[PDB]
Design a protein around this ligand. Sequence first.
Ligand code: 07D
Ligand SMILES: CCc1c(C)c2cc3nc(cc4[nH]c(c(CCC(=O)OC/C=C(\C)CC/C=C(\C)CC/C=C(\C)CCC=C(C)C)c4C)c4c5nc(cc1[nH]2)C(C)=C5C(=O)[C@@H]4C(=O)OC)C(C)=C3C(C)=O
Ligand SMILES: COC(C)(C)C\C=C/C(C)=C/C=C/C(C)=C/C=C/C(C)=C/C=C\C=C(C)\C=C\C=C(C)\C=C\C=C(C)\C=C\CC(C)(C)OC
Ligand SMILES: CCCCCCCCCCCCO[C@@H]1O[C@H](CO)[C@@H](O[C@H]2O[C@H](CO)[C@@H](O)[C@H](O)[C@H]2O)[C@H](O)[C@H]1O
Ligand SMILES: CCCCCCCCCCCCO[C@@H]1O[C@H](CO)[C@@H](O[C@H]2O[C@H](CO)[C@@H](O)[C@H](O)[C@H]2O)[C@H](O)[C@H]1O
Ligand SMILES: CCCCCCCCCCCCO[C@@H]1O[C@H](CO)[C@@H](O[C@H]2O[C@H](CO)[C@@H](O)[C@H](O)[C@H]2O)[C@H](O)[C@H]1O
Ligand SMILES: CCCCCCCCCCCCO[C@@H]1O[C@H](CO)[C@@H](O[C@H]2O[C@H](CO)[C@@H](O)[C@H](O)[C@H]2O)[C@H](O)[C@H]1O
Ligand SMILES: [Fe+3]
Lengths: 256, 304, 47, 47, 47, 47, 47, 47, 47, 47, 47, 45, 45, 44, 275
Amino acid sequence: NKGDITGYMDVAQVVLYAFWIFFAGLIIYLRREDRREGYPLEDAISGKINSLQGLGSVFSIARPKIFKLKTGATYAAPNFKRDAVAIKATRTAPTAGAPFEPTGNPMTDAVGPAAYALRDELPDLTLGGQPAIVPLRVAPTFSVAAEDTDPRGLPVVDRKGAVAGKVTDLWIDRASIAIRYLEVELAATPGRKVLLPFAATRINAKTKSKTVTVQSILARHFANVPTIAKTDSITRREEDKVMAYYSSGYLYSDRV
Amino acid sequence: EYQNILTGVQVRTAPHSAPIAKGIFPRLGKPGFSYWLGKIGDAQIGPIYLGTTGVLSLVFGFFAIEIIGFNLLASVNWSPMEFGRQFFWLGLEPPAAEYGLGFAPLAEGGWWQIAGFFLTTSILLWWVRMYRRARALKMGTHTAWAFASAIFLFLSLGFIRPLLMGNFSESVPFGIFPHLEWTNSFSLNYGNFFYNPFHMLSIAFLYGSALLFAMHGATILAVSRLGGDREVEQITDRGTAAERAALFWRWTMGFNATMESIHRWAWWFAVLCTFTGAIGILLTGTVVDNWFEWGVKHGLAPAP
Amino acid sequence: MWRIWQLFDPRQALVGLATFLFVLALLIHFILLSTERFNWLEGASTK
Amino acid sequence: MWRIWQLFDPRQALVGLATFLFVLALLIHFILLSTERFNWLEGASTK
Amino acid sequence: MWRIWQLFDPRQALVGLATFLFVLALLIHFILLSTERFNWLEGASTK
Amino acid sequence: MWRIWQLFDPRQALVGLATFLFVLALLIHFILLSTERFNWLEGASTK
Amino acid sequence: MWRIWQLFDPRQALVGLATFLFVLALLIHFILLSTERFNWLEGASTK
Amino acid sequence: MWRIWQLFDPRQALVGLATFLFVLALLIHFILLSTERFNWLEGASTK
Amino acid sequence: MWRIWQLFDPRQALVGLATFLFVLALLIHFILLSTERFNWLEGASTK
Amino acid sequence: MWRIWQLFDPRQALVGLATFLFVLALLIHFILLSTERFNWLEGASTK
Amino acid sequence: MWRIWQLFDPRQALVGLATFLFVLALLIHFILLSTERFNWLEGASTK
Amino acid sequence: ITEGEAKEFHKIFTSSILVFFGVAAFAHLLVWIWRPWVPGPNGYS
Amino acid sequence: ITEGEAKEFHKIFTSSILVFFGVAAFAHLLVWIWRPWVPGPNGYS
Amino acid sequence: TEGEAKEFHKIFTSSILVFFGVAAFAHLLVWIWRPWVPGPNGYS
Amino acid sequence: ALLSFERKYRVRGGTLIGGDLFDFWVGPFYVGFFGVTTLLFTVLGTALIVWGAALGPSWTFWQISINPPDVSYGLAMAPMAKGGLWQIITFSAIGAFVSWALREVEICRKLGIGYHIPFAFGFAILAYVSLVVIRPVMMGAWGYGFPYGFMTHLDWVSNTGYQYANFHYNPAHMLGITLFFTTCLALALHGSLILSAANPGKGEVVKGPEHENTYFQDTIGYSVGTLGIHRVGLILALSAVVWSIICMILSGPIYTGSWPDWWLWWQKLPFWNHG
Ligand code: 07D
Ligand SMILES: CCc1c(C)c2cc3nc(cc4[nH]c(c(CCC(=O)OC/C=C(\C)CC/C=C(\C)CC/C=C(\C)CCC=C(C)C)c4C)c4c5nc(cc1[nH]2)C(C)=C5C(=O)[C@@H]4C(=O)OC)C(C)=C3C(C)=O
Ligand SMILES: COC(C)(C)C\C=C/C(C)=C/C=C/C(C)=C/C=C/C(C)=C/C=C\C=C(C)\C=C\C=C(C)\C=C\C=C(C)\C=C\CC(C)(C)OC
Ligand SMILES: CCCCCCCCCCCCO[C@@H]1O[C@H](CO)[C@@H](O[C@H]2O[C@H](CO)[C@@H](O)[C@H](O)[C@H]2O)[C@H](O)[C@H]1O
Ligand SMILES: CCCCCCCCCCCCO[C@@H]1O[C@H](CO)[C@@H](O[C@H]2O[C@H](CO)[C@@H](O)[C@H](O)[C@H]2O)[C@H](O)[C@H]1O
Ligand SMILES: CCCCCCCCCCCCO[C@@H]1O[C@H](CO)[C@@H](O[C@H]2O[C@H](CO)[C@@H](O)[C@H](O)[C@H]2O)[C@H](O)[C@H]1O
Ligand SMILES: CCCCCCCCCCCCO[C@@H]1O[C@H](CO)[C@@H](O[C@H]2O[C@H](CO)[C@@H](O)[C@H](O)[C@H]2O)[C@H](O)[C@H]1O
Ligand SMILES: [Fe+3]
């Protein structure tokens, strides 16, 4: 009557169907944006570019958008830079859906939860073109705020209670003011130094004494933590490697 | 077992900010630090930028708020006690039907119209402020358009639908309980606002926004041990945090987003929540008198 | 008096003054429009 | 038109055709089922 | 006029055109189904 | 026709086809059950 | 007026023009459908 | 047909098939309990 | 007056002015359709 | 009063002035339309 | 009893005492204003 | 896939699909015998 | 922008604005001939 | 700069005056059509 | 069928139950024991929903409804024809949700990430359980749960809301609405800030965390931080769900009257109870 267009069809229904068309287009756009990393898909066994995909393939992958960096650098998304098919693991079954048996110590072989993305060897930059993740020694201005336990010199122990080492230095992000890493000197090897992510620590400020505990890896696992080069500025690949190694603890912290 | 839900150890440094052209106005606010905010997020407070558009928006908004509060206090004969008693029930009511879209007497809705105009102007000037602040920092204006969606819903509720009906009588009052009562009576007058399909779409997108911002928050907190909280850096250089975030949802759900595109989903769900809502508000009364009868006609109801 | 601009930046003073005067004038015109006597467009009779 | 397979991979065209024609067959069947005349399950009278 | 295909990938153009044409055809068919006169399934009389 | 398995893996084809056939059979059985004439459980007279 | 394409990308401008024209045409068609006089599906009388 | 176990591992396909069979059997029993003739617990008369 | 394009880029100025003019034209047309006298689709009598 | 441009920036001042003038023009036009005497689109009788 | 002042510095102690006493005075005065007998402003009769 | 198994798989698939189609056809024939599903121009008298 | 291309853009922009204003003025004159939009003292009719 | 302010003001004032002249002509025409200051007995 | 980086984390282990039996993938999905169980419950519940649609009079997707048993049955199991099907679908839905969350736990262990996502999903499962189990049990009948239907569960929402004559006046409902709206606003702001930082315009190199902090320091006066924003967003959504659960437990099990006149307590505090 008042709002109809043709007998049964009215304005509200037409606007609804217009929204449905727009939402289908928006879903297509959002899925195109989603398919900007890890695409196109590879075969599970051989690794050839194959996938059960229809007429939407032409619309599935977007043209590489270009990200500009404040160093002259550039990222392409999608960049069709893929991983090698042969990893340090073997198929439990040759059925393309089976999982992988690691063929070694997966902590130091970067297999599974220990696997780290193959990033670039450049530290995160600040607004001034300098490394963002730095030790507190080479950032005199930065200081640990009061009313919080200072995690310097506290014993670093695992869940079993064994004192893995001692913390000497804190590594912090300059871009976002927060602690990133604790520098830990090994009680077993003074000549060895490791980085333990701050996200992997408990404050433990409420106990008989003050200590730093880690629930992921055991004390001996601190003897194989990946090392870094500059000791005062850490690249993205190095930090990603260290975090992946520490995060691999929970799955297989007691052998494989 | 740490979770990155609270920051046990905080860091405090010399406050600093990205460089902007000086302009007519400087940065204002003598930045300080707070402890609970630093426990949940960053600790620094301010400084707030107050440009020409900022001054304009603040003046218009303050004028509107003072008009609204003066009217609310005057409605209870300036009694602070009785103002406390009725504060939730107090409301600046819109002008009646007979006055159309013209100026009503101040007591009969003129103050409501003046306050609504000043509030609309301040909100639009705040939108311009968000746009200009994003452009000044050499950034994109996604926040401005996300805000424009909400402004569309606000103007549809307060101004656009009155324009279409030629009448401010059915606009929403300036009160705590009165605006809820407006919501209830608007739904009742137009037949079970559940049967509005754009209301259903808006509820779907509100539920989806909560769902998405729980999924995404929990995902980033789950990969925060892997540098996953540093989302823009994982967007420009994909780390293993982003890879595991994608693979979790790919294995549990069949598909996944990018660290960049998940926020496109986040943007669009929030924007659509209010876009469909504004459309549904603009459609009621003008095109669809009774949403229950529309639902009966179109198969949403069992046709009593 | 002559040094009022040695404490206030003339750009900020002018912008704030213009904003306040514009909003106040708009408010006054709106209030007169909301009257049976000073609404010059409705033009209701004095008597 | 034998050349269109230079543009369209046979796997992609075949999967897309399968899905599209299945959905269209469902749609047409459901439309027929919602009609008074061609709903072959209740078999309502023509006259 | 043969130059348009230098602007657009023929796969993109063809798939998009097929999508647009099918959606438009579905739209028109449903609009006709909504009318009393052109609905061929209930077939209301012309009179 | 046998070249179809040079496009499609047989294992995933079998599992997907089994799932699709089972869902279709469930759908048709349920549709018949909702039908007055073809509900073999309620069993109303066809006369 | 041939220098406009030195400012606007022919592909992007042509796509945007096509989409804008399609939406405008669709809206005009639905507006005419809404009116009594120009609805060509019901076909109401001029008088 | 003895070769099907090359396509599907018995140790897991068997358990998945057992789960599917249990679901189907329990669904059919629920459907029968929902009826009026084949509900052996209600035991409603056929006459 | 040619120096104004010194301050403003021809391309952004063109797109902004184009959108502004189209939106204003749409608004004026919708206003006219809202008025009884100037609705050319309903065609109400001048009397 | 030529030094008014030695304080503020011509480009931002011009865009702000154009936006403000257009918004004020829209507001005055809308107010006039909302009045019976000065609504030039509706039939406006002086008496 | 003077030993209070080496745990509570007089700055915070006195500001807290001032806020507490002022809030309590406001409370008691308002409570009296809510009662008819003691509302010294409305001044309802004792009887 | 290796073509050396496609010959066997297609023959098994063809045999099984004909078996499935024949069983379905016999079931449809039985249902039609019990109750046909194509009404005449009066309904289901 | 470069002053040399600024002159050319200003020239042909001025021509285009003249064209748009002329077409719009013709449209307004046609509408006014059809139905004027400035009412008289006693309304319209 | 401030040197360009002279020419900017030279053209800005001419634009101000032409815009104001068009606006004033519009106001004069509207006042002929319908003046907007009512008298003691309202409008007539 | 794998992402460019997928065939590196597809290791075994990380499963709570099943050992190596179901530790595999089907297409993109990980199955596990709890994927099998969520298929078990989903297939059965969906089949029962379609069966109730067949027993229903519509087949109209928006008019298909599974109703809970009438309140005259109390907390008793109901006959499948009249009420029992809703109960079985409820139990199947609970089992499927729990299986989904547990499968998410296994995936989290396999990828070595935190268990935040299944914990957050636990709140949605709890909201559903409070709506179909906890509240009906406290109220004493299964007929206080909502029907499983597209538009009929909205009829349930409206009927129960107007049972207390205005359900807006439920203060826990006000707080849940505030949290939901604030979650939507915060999600809009966060997605917008991330997109604007990643896509700053022509030229316009990608901005860092300092630019993102500066934007909201200038516009609002405070910036939460690129890590704390996900914290506050997850807490906002979970708290919205918690306060919705609270407002629905308060209505019926605890409060059985008009919510609007619950607020008279506020009207009659002793320092303005003018009487
Ligand atoms: C008896 C009531 C009846 C009942 C049936 C029912 C029930 C439900 N509903 Mg509904 N609702 C009914 C009526 C009804 N409902 C809505 C709206 C929604 C949307 C709002 C989205 C939003 O974010 O809004 C909120 C966003 C706005 C209003 C837009 C942005 C606001 C801005 C920028 C304000 C800026 C402010 C300042 C700067 C501050 C200073 C100003 C001052 C001091 C004055 C959302 C999806 C939503 C949800 C649900 C659910 C979940 C349910 C359940 C579970 O039952 N409802 C609005 C709408 O869009 O409708 C299409 C609307 O107008 C309207 C009406 C009349
Ligand atoms: C996707 C849809 C989503 C939905 C669900 C959603 C809902 C609601 N969003 C709501 C409120 C606001 N939203 C905002 C801002 C505007 C501020 C304003 O207008 O100030 C302009 C007004 C005023 C100036 C008037 C008063 C002023 C006061 C109280 C101060 C007076 C005193 C003074 C000046 C003196 C003292 C101080 C000195 C310094 C001297 C407010 C807080 C904004 C945004 N929403 C977005 C989106 C969404 N908003 C996005 C993307 C945003 C922005 O960009 C923008 C912003 O700044 O966000 C941080 C409300 C009430 C909502 C509900 C539920 O109803
Ligand atoms: C700082 O304050 C101190 C004094 C403490 C206290 C002051 C004030 C107080 C206590 C204020 C409290 C205010 C409250 C409780 C406000 C509640 C507000 C709510 C909930 C509002 C909710 C919705 C209202 C909306 C959405 C209204 C929208 C109205 C609009 C958009 C109207 C626009 C109208 C226009 C543009 C009118 C045009 C017509 C004319 C011709 C008049 O325009 C010139
Ligand atoms: C008329 C009815 C009521 C509506 C209010 C109309 C007046 C208020 C809105 C006018 C339009 C504002 O539009 C905006 O104006 C301000 C100046 O004021 C300008 O912006 C200016 O202030 C900003 C503040 O961040 C500074 O960077 C700089 O001093 C300058 O750019 C913008 O370039 C213009 O986009
Ligand atoms: C996987 C197997 C799928 C099998 C699918 C089989 C599809 C075809 C089945 C129906 C074939 C047609 O079947 C035929 O239909 C005509 C209607 O024109 C009917 O015709 C017969 O019955 C009707 C009344 O019921 C009489 O009016 C008519 O005179 C008589 O000849 C019969 O029902 C049958 O003779
Ligand atoms: C360039 C494109 C855009 C162009 C926009 C410009 C449009 C200008 C329109 C108004 C111009 C003035 O138009 C003039 O108005 C006067 C009122 O003062 C009208 O007034 C005259 O005609 C009306 C018609 O009913 C009589 O009732 C009235 O007594 C008489 O004075 C004239 O008929 C008209 O010629
Ligand atoms: C940039 C634009 C600037 C616009 C400036 C506008 C200035 C306004 C000038 C007002 C001139 C006064 O002109 C005088 O006013 C009186 C009221 O006092 C009005 O009085 C007259 O009109 C009214 C109403 O139509 C009637 O009662 C009667 O016809 C007569 O009294 C007339 O209009 C005129 O006689
Ligand atoms: Fe994020």
